[PDB]
Design a binder for this molecule. Structure first.
Ligand SMILES: Nc1ncnc2c1ncn2[C@@H]1O[C@H](COP(=O)(O)OP(=O)(O)O)[C@@H](O)[C@H]1O
Lengths: 66, 472
DNA sequence: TGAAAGTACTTGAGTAG
């Protein structure tokens, strides 16, 4: 709830923006507004995203790393 | 030294706009007050500081904006000018004509002092320097009460066009695209003018930096210097470059000349700067609410805002409309105006806007009623027989209305005397005073007062018809 | 022909020099 209203990655670096994820059935879509526009988020891509999350950054999410 | 001053003294004399030379002459010849109104970047410092360098005494300048005063002083110090900043040869001419005007959104002043100094040195140059518009111009001719140097064809460096938010599915996306097809400074209405719009634009990939009242002065100077060297192309400001690719207004400005001034800070060299206006009916009604509650807590403001509204909703050239507003002749301008580039597109857009004009229910109806009704909008002489007659607890209850109600009560009492043989009129005066005062304290609105006095006179008639004396 | 209620989610949305 606190993290949904942030569309910009401020804190740390990575000054880029964050897309809106929309679920259509079994597919995810990263509807980049203007920063192409719609990309079907492949599960390999989300796997690559998740593999980089630090242990602290997943324990704060509630998911114990172990 | 009308022209012998040259650029060598401060920095200027080169006849920037050939009548710029005469701008000195208009002061040099002492032609009373000359209405210097030119596009931004016209070197007005030549117009009203050269006589300051050449005055036998002082030439006090009315540049309210202290930051502006300090910037002028230091920029002239870079030009070796004996000017001193008194804000907080020249001590810092009736300058900044918008300062004395509410249309230039600079009518935020105090006493005279600088104005008092100018009135003292009326023998010294008395000049008035982008407000030469019959409404605004006559306001200067009335409130300030002074040759018009208004630019003959205003400025053809802006591709004026109006896009309606209702017609556009994504007004944020539309303005982002317009900025893409064009630095930039953007104004809009209040309620955190910068913050939300700048955040949306930045989410649109267009970095927009805020400049608001609550922002720190360090943030102000940082964003200003960054915008000077193109570090931040897009700056959003409330009312606060020779390119300026867009000066579009997300919401309507406070005043017609306010909009002119906020869109007139583009094209120092004369390069095209587009400039677009976004209009919404709800925005119009909201600002009408704001101006009405401002004047309530004066008719010129609403008159000029209605003029702005009909300007944004008229079928014709924007430069022609501003000529009607600024008093110039027919602009006869080429492509560069929305009606000039395509009359059919403007007419179709206005027709589409007209066609698309049409606990939560409580507030919705309240706002509707207020917006639909707003647009629809003496002491007692010698011997008034009323207790505390000099009171206004009942709104819109004229003293003549009180006299008429008292006369109705008095003829009722006369009939009661003829039917029941009361004492006399001498004490009937005090009795009527007491009755009217009691009716006053038992009613709140004018209609309620009339209803209460009618009920009381009906009761008096009933008592008279019953035959018994009108007792307490 | 003739199921329906609590909790999600899912979007757009929303006062000055
Ligand atoms: N007559 C001129 N010839 C060449 N350059 C000039 C001339 N006058 C002004 N400039 C430059 O243009 C700048 C504009 O100064 P300013 O008086 O604030 O313009 P504005 O008319 O918009 O108020 C000045 O700083 C000056 O350096």
């Amino acid at each position: 709830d606190l993290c949904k209203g942030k569309n910009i990655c401020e804190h740390g670096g990575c000054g880029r923006y964050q897309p809106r994820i929309r679920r259509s059935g079994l597919e995810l879509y990263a509807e980049w507004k203007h920063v192409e526009k719609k990309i079907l988020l492949s599960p390999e891509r989300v796997h690559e995203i998740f593999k980089r999350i630090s242990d602290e950054e997943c324990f704060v999410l509630g998911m114990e790393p172990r | 030294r009308v022209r012998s001053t040259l650029k060598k003294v401060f920095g200027f004399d080169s006849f920037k706009t050939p009548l710029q030379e005469s701008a000195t002459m208009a002061v040099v010849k002492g032609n009373k007050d000359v209405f210097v109104c030119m596009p931004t970047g016209a070197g007005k410092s030549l117009c009203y500081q050269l006589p300051a360098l050449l005055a036998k005494g002082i030439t006090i300048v009315v540049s309210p904006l202290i930051a502006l005063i300090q910037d002028q002083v230091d920029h002239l110090l870079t030009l070796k000018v004996r000017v001193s900043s008194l804000n907080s040869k020249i001590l810092y001419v009736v300058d900044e004509a918008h300062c004395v005007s509410q249309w230039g959104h600079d009518f935020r002043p105090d006493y005279l002092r600088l104005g008092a100094l100018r009135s003292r040195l009326g023998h010294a140059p008395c000049v008035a320097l982008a407000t030469a518009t019959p409404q605004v111009q006559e306001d200067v001719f009335a409130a300030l009460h002074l040759a018009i140097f208004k630019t003959p064809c205003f400025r053809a460096n802006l591709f004026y066009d109006v896009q309606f938010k209702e017609l556009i599915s994504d007004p944020y996306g539309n303005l982002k695209d317009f900025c893409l097809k064009a630095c930039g400074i953007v104004y809009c209405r209040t309620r955190e003018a910068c913050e939300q719009l700048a955040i949306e634009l930045s989410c649109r990939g267009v970095n927009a930096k805020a400049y608001h009242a609550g922002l720190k002065a360090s943030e102000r100077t940082l964003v200003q210097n960054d915008w000077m060297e193109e570090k931040v192309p897009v700056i959003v400001a409330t009312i606060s470059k020779a390119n300026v690719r867009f000066v579009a207004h997300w919401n309507i400005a406070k005043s017609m000349a306010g909009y002119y001034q906020e869109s007139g800070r583009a094209g120092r060299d004369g390069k095209p700067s587009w400039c677009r206006l976004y209009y919404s009916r709800n925005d119009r009604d909201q600002v009408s609410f704001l101006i009405r509650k401002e004047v309530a807590k004066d008719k010129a403001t609403i008159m000029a805002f209605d003029a702005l509204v009909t300007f944004c909703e008229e079928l014709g050239c924007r430069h022609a409309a501003i000529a009607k507003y600024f008093g110039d002749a027919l602009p006869a301008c080429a492509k560069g105006c929305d009606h000039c580039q395509n009359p059919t597109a403007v007419r179709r857009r206005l027709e589409a806007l007209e066609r698309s004009s049409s606990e939560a229910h409580k507030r919705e109806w309240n706002l509707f009623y207020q917006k639909q009704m707003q647009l629809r909008k003496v002491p007692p002489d010698e011997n008034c027989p009323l207790k505390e007659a000099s009171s206004r607890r009942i709104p819109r209850l004229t003293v003549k209305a009180r006299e008429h109600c008292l006369r109705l009560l008095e003829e009722a009492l006369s009939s009661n005397r003829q039917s029941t043989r009361t004492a006399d009129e001498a004490d009937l005066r005090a009795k009527a005073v007491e009755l009217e005062h009691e009716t006053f304290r038992n009613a709140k609105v004018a209609n309620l007062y009339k209803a209460s006095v009618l009920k009381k006179v009906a009761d008096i008639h009933r008592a008279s018809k019953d035959g018994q004396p009108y007792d307490m």
